């Protein structure tokens, strides 16, 4: 049976449907981190032109179909769609179709055969981000504490300047 080519063949296949894909910008590059699959993708902040993908008509259809189903299933009662879908070419050869959300409150892409490089990025970021947040609070608390002790040393010196001066002077 004969059928048209463009709507029958694709050069990209839908891999994963992420419900929560947080996008952040730091170091001059967007970082799409998914907490569900524990993966982090890096891009160049420039929307990869979908027209550049050879035989990629199935990608506007597949991406929009998943977005509509996911939005109505979970984000209809709490979030709102902002703009149209955005396609970004991530490091390693992964094309990410992104749909920003807000709270009510010609060539062929070569995909790498291992996503473990991205999983390590998420794991390191998931351990570095909090540990640094807790290293930052401890440092802040220590400084606030030291400034608090000065109120006691200013009075302890009068009681016995010999002992206070000895430990402070060295």
């Amino acid at each position, epitope marked *: 049976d004969w059928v048209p080519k463009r709507p029958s063949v694709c050069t990209m296949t839908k891999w994963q449907e992420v419900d929560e894909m947080l996008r952040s910008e730091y170091g001059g590059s967007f970082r799409f981190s998914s907490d569900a699959i524990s993966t982090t993708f890096t891009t160049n902040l*420039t*929307e990869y032109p979908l027209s550049r993908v050879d035989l990629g008509d199935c990608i506007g259809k597949d991406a*929009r179909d998943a*977005m*509509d189903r996911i*939005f*109505a299933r979970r984000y*209809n009662a709490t979030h*709102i*769609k*902002v*703009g*149209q879908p*955005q396609y970004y070419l991530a490091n390693g050869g992964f094309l990410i179709a992104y749909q*920003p959300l*807000l709270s*009510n409150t010609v060539e062929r892409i070569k995909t790498t055969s291992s996503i473990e490089f991205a999983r390590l990025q998420f794991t390191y970021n998931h351990i570095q981000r909090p540990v640094n947040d807790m290293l930052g609070r401890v440092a802040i608390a220590w400084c606030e504490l030291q400034n608090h002790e000065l109120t006691l040393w200013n009075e302890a010196r009068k009681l016995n300047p010999n002992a206070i001066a000895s430990v402070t002077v060295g």
Partner: antibody
Framework: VQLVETGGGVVRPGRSLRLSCTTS????????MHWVRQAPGKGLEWVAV????????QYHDSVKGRFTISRDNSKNVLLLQMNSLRVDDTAMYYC?????????????????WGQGTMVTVSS | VIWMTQSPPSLSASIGDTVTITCRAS??????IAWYQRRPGKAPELLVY???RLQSGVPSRLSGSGSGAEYTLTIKNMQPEDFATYYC?????????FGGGTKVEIK
């Protein structure tokens, strides 16, 4: 907020015309701009869009390849260079800013509209 | 191109009554749709976004609803300043298309 458009007038078919839209009251560099037309006694129709920084441009199938949208963030002025005009292009052109909901996304909706100017194609 | 069918093209209402304007698209657009208002002699002004988000400063008595390819805009208490042309525009896929428009007038 205030939006003003300049460059309208009567032009012969197949000729070029360039419109300009001045802005004030909002961060021009932080919001995308859109162009809308209103034919006499007809409905509204979108023309084109220019991102906040102008990196991406999108046009309507009825004006793709004929029009040319551009912006100058330094002078906070929007422009739409028109070429190869046709009789069907006779309409009131309005310049409108997108709805700011997120920092760099394009809402593809209109929140502020200008006074509009006429562009009549006659011979 | 996603055609936008808006009806009724024209209807009349009295001050202090309920009205409902229906807008239909040629294909399912989830919730990507906006509503506008254009008073005589003035430029249009946005009212609702994504079929449910009311714009800042818009009266709370005016609200929209619907899903898929069916959408509606309702006003529970008409005021003299509400009589104007209302347009429904979609942004699910390019090119952006507006509705036929419905002119609410005094009856």
């Amino acid at each position: 907020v205030q939006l003003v458009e300049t460059g309208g007038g009567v032009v012969r078919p197949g000729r070029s015309l360039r419109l300009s839209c001045t802005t004030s009251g909002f961060s021009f560099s932080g919001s995308a701009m859109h162009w809308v037309r209103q034919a006499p006694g007809k409905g509204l129709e979108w023309v084109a869009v220019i991102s906040h920084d102008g990196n991406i441009i999108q046009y309507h199938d009825s004006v793709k390849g004929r029009f040319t949208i551009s912006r100058d963030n330094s002078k906070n002025v929007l422009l739409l260079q028109m070429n190869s005009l046709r009789v069907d292009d006779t309409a009131m052109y309005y310049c409108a800013r997108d709805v700011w909901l997120l920092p760099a996304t394009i809402s593809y909706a209109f929140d502020f509209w200008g006074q509009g100017t006429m562009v009549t194609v006659s011979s | 191109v996603i055609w936008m069918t808006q009806s009724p093209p024209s209807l009349s209402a009295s001050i202090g009554d309920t009205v409902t304007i229906t807008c239909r698209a040629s294909q399912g657009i989830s919730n990507s749709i906006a509503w506008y208002q254009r008073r005589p002699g003035k430029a249009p002004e946005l009212l609702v976004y994504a079929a449910y988000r009311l714009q800042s400063g818009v009266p709370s008595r005016l609200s929209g609803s619907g899903s898929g390819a069916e959408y509606t805009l309702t006003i529970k208490n008409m005021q003299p300043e509400d009589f104007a042309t209302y347009y429904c525009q979609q942004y699910y896929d390019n090119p952006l298309t507006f509705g036929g428009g419905t002119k609410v007038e005094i009856k």
